Amino acid sequence: NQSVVVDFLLPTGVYLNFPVSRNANLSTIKQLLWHRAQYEPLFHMLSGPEAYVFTCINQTAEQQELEDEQRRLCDVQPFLPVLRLVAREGDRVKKLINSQISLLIGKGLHEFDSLCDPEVNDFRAKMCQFCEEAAARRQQLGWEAWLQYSFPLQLEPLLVNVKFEGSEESFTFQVSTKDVPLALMACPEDYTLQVNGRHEYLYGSYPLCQFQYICSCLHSGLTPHLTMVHSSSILAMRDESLWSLEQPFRIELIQGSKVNADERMKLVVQAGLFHGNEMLCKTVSSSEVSVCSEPVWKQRLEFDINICDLPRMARLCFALYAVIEDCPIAWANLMLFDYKDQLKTGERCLYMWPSVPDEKGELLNPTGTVRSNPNTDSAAALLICLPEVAPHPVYYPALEKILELGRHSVTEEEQLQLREILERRGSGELYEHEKDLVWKLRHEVQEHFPEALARLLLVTKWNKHEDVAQMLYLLCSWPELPVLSALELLDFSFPDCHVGSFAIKSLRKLTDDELFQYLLQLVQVLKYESYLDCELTKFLLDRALANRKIGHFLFWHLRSEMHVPSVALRFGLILEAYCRGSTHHMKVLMKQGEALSKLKALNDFVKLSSQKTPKPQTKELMHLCMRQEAYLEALSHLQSPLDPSTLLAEVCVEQCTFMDSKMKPLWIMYSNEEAGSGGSVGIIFKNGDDLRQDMLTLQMIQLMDVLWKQEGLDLRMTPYGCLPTGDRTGLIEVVLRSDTIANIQLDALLNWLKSKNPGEALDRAIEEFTLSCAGYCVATYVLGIGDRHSDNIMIRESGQLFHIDFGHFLGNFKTRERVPFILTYDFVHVIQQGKTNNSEKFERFRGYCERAYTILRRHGLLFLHLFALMRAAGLPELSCSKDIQYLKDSLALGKTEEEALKHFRVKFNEALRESW
Amino acid sequence: VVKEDNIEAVGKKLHEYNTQFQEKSREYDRLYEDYTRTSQEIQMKRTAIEAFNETIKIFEEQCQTQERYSKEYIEKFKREGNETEIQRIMHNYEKLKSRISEIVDSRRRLEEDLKKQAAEYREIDKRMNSIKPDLIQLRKTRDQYLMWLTQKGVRQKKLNEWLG
Numbered sequence A: 001n002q003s004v005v006v007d008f009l010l011p012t013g014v015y016l017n018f019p020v021s022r023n024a025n026l027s028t029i030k031q032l033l034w035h036r037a038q039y040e041p042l043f044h045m046l047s048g049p050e051a052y053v054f055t056c057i058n059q060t061a062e063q064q065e066l067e068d069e070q071r072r073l074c075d076v077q078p079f080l081p082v083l084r085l086v087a088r089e090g091d092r093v094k095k096l097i098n099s100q101i102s103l104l105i106g107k108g109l110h111e112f113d114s115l116c117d118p119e120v121n122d123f124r125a126k127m128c129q130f131c132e133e134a135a136a137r138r139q140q141l142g143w144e145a146w147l148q149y150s151f152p153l154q155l156e157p158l159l160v161n162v163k164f165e166g167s168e169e170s171f172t173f174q175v176s177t178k179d180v181p182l183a184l185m186a187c188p189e190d191y192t193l194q195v196n197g198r199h200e201y202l203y204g205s206y207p208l209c210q211f212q213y214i215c216s217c218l219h220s221g222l223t224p225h226l227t228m229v230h231s232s233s234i235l236a237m238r239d240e241s242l243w244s245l246e247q248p249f250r251i252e253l254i255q256g257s258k259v260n261a262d263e264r265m266k267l268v269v270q271a272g273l274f275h276g277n278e279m280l281c282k283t284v285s286s287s288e289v290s291v292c293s294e295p296v297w298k299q300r301l302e303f304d305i306n307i308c309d310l311p312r313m314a315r316l317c318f319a320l321y322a323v324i325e326d327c328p329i330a331w332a333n334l335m336l337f338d339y340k341d342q343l344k345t346g347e348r349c350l351y352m353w354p355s356v357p358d359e360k361g362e363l364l365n366p367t368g369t370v371r372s373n374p375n376t377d378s379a380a381a382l383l384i385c386l387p388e389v390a391p392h393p394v395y396y397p398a399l400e401k402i403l404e405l406g407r408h409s410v411t412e413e414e415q416l417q418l419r420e421i422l423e424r425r426g427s428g429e430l431y432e433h434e435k436d437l438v439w440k441l442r443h444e445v446q447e448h449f450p451e452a453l454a455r456l457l458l459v460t461k462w463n464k465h466e467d468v469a470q471m472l473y474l475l476c477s478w479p480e481l482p483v484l485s486a487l488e489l490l491d492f493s494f495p496d497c498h499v500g501s502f503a504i505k506s507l508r509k510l511t512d513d514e515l516f517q518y519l520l521q522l523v524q525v526l527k528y529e530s531y532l533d534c535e536l537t538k539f540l541l542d543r544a545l546a547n548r549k550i551g552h553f554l555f556w557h558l559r560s561e562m563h564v565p566s567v568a569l570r571f572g573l574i575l576e577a578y579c580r581g582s583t584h585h586m587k588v589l590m591k592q593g594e595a596l597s598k599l600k601a602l603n604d605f606v607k608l609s610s611q612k613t614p615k616p617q618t619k620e621l622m623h624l625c626m627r628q629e630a631y632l633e634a635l636s637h638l639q640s641p642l643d644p645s646t647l648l649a650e651v652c653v654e655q656c657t658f659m660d661s662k663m664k665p666l667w668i669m670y671s672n673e674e675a676g677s678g679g680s681v682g683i684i685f686k687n688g689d690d691l692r693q694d695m696l697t698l699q700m701i702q703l704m705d706v707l708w709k710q711e712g713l714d715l716r717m718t719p720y721g722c723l724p725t726g727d728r729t730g731l732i733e734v735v736l737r738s739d740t741i742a743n744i745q746l747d748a749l750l751n752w753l754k755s756k757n758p759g760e761a762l763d764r765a766i767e768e769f770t771l772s773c774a775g776y777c778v779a780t781y782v783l784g785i786g787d788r789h790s791d792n793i794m795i796r797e798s799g800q801l802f803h804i805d806f807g808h809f810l811g812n813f814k815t816r817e818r819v820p821f822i823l824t825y826d827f828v829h830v831i832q833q834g835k836t837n838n839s840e841k842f843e844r845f846r847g848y849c850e851r852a853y854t855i856l857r858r859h860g861l862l863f864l865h866l867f868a869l870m871r872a873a874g875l876p877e878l879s880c881s882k883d884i885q886y887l888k889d890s891l892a893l894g895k896t897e898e899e900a901l902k903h904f905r906v907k908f909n910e911a912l913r914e915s916w
Numbered sequence B: 001v002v003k004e005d006n007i008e009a010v011g012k013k014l015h016e017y018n019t020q021f022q023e024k025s026r027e028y029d030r031l032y033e034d035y036t037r038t039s040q041e042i043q044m045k046r047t048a049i050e051a052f053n054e055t056i057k058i059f060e061e062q063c064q065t066q067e068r069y070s071k072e073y074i075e076k077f078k079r080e081g082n083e084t085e086i087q088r089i090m091h092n093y094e095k096l097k098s099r100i101s102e103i104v105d106s107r108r109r110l111e112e113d114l115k116k117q118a119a120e121y122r123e124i125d126k127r128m129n130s131i132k133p134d135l136i137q138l139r140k141t142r143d144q145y146l147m148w149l150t151q152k153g154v155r156q157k158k159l160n161e162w163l164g
């Protein structure tokens, strides 16, 4: 029904109720309200319309003050149609923000308050102050600083058509490759240079050659367009009691709750202490109580370790099994110490997570989150009591008191063996004899092998407190390590906060471009952090508040996992603090979410109508929905989530279509008269598949493309954008001028690349095809991408090959085999350009594959480190050291450079056989 | 663990257990879709009740206000010669109260939904916790057979045929 009966609550206590249109705005509603009010009691006591402001209850179940009266009623989307008038004056600043944050992150901010949790409360206090604090320092800075923040420089690893702002007519000047932005603005310092129809500005001390736009203009074969921008235009946008306790650690296991186990079986609760992955001591186990919904054990579970021997990140881990006189029911982990450093005491209810069947099935799940199960009403839980250890409570010792142990408390033979022992292979496992070597020459490690910190940490006995002091003493005076070495230290294997701190300190030298390359991995590391208030989160917020691209993509990485109970709280709290320090960007992100909300709703209609109607008519039925007042304005004029510099202005409803295949992805086309001749963006909305593995894959192909460019090989890759935005939802960037091999192939493939760019530019298109084939053949080989065929590889009109729909990787495939290198015979023909025995070209191609692969080996450990961190993400195809071992074998890291290069040559030639 | 003597017999059973495993593993995955979708729906209902609660709260704030304001208004303007707007004011307030019952009733209908769904959710979780031990044993039995045959040198071609 197009109109809605709405309840109106006047401030006198008077109640009015009548229909309005769903698409009517609040300003109009108020005019109709007043007109009706006349004919009710107490009208004369009311002030005028403008003295009041509507209130409603959100979809998130919170009171919202509707300050902006241009919003439509259907867009406000109140729970029930109930509007209540209140005084327009009323400290609105914090009110309207909190409202937006809730509707933007999806979770209501009241849901944090309701937890009655001091850790949560502290976090929200400290960070929202910090992010506000940052924001204020942003506004305090001038025009140069804010431009740097707003839109950072997009840089690489003829003529120029400049023009003055606010003018249709322009003047086509000419400039060559190398020239500085100051030198450009000469042919000044008050202005800046801006790319036409995009939020992308040229500034700083870099030359014109090193900017992405100017480079991108050359290979397409087109003239650029830039624009001068006065500071007024920029500012307009800117404005708008110690470890003496030698008592063995014990815990009381009291009772369970809400257990949905089988009645004939029997319940048992196994448990164990852990420092990350390693066991502090052996696992104890409960008595076999009969299966109740409310079981009762009442046992003192004493462990083989003292309270004085517990490390800061000691973690007790529980698991409830069910046995026929075995079924894992549920698991739940606890940190022994708390977030303010106190050793926990008293009763504690552990709301447990349900046990997913693994292929292996370990005793407990120590890797699993310390975060509680939010589903407290329905979840099973375990009542336990952590006892009173001393008459007044105890904290973990302070750094000064830790340093006191090292404060007061070398053979040439020993030395030479350590050089061998610590210089050798990737890792594997050292022996207890050699572990003592590493512990013995542990200062000599700090003095001569600074980058072997990870190995020394592993060999440290974390179940003995004297060793923990000795280690942490050395770590405090440890020399700064590289980024590569630092990323390794971020892995779950090193839980101690001092390692985490040292890691982040070494990561602080990261440039923003480099930090962006690892952001996905850094976000996943949050998942296994112990406490909310941590140095990684502070790091990410600090960097997000300083760089709006970092902040943008930080937002979406977190937003897109808000539907996951294990991270919802943590990520929700970060998004809140990000929003508070980024009030302007909050508005852009809102218009995106509102777009995304509409695209899901639009995709639902295509999903219903595709099952009934045929394809050509359903396309027109999609348009009819898109032409509407709500669907047009919400989809129009927004920054792309895939690239906030891209401006998606006017939707091309006629050009918009869909694929009637599987998850019915929607093809949304955009046009805008500012961008240029090739100024039409496209985006693929897609709901039903999980895009995270797709994103990892593409990002890893990006990194390959960067690494090759640094060493001087441009393999003409197409690293098109892919952003998960929600629960099995995201955008993929449309690549224009392209088609599948299948559709071209339905002798034929050679004729297509001839037609688009004939004559002289054909040889360039062959050079584009050969160059990109090299890259994508190595990339897919190294990453182990399988199920590669006609309909999931595309070719661009320029010549460039690129891959799509990365379903599987690292050898994984059906319900797991080593992927051979793949030269397709069709593709080999195009490289040999028609002729049969074209050794000239094909030797140079193989020459490039050998080079590409070699460069990737040199940064092998980077890929291992990044993939290591992604084990956190819980992707089914990347969940263990064996999935990582795939890359070690594909990059051939354990062999010499000569050995790997010949191994690759053998695999190449093995492919060249199977071609025929 | 292996209850057969000859390769071909053992291989035939390997096929049964692998087929049993794959069928059961599918039944669990089917129930896991139901389970998780239900959690999602429950979480939605649970917040919708919060929205009802918070809406009813707003309606009761009106009721407090009209009571107070009516009383104050009547006293300032005496209720003397002017009594025409009192029956109006009171009749409006009957409508206000009457609307609150409708809303209170809807909350009551949703709560009864949430309760029915919550019991389904628990029945899903019961069903999967009885599947779990079967799934684990069938996996462990399947593997024992694959071992047995591999130890005996049976060729991968025969094993692939038995796993299809």
Ligand SMILES: C[C@H](Nc1ncnc(N)c1C#N)c1nn2cccc2c(=O)n1-c1ccccc1
Pocket: A657, A658, A659, A665, A666, A667, A684, A720, A732, A733, A734, A735, A736, A738, A739, A740, A743, A804, A805
């Ligand atoms: C199959 C293709 N996928 C992509 N196309 C363009 N850019 C991309 N980044 C992708 C991807 N992934 C593609 N995807 N798609 C989703 C919805 C509609 C379409 C579509 O029409 N094509 C398509 C088919 C033939 C030729 C050209 C395009």
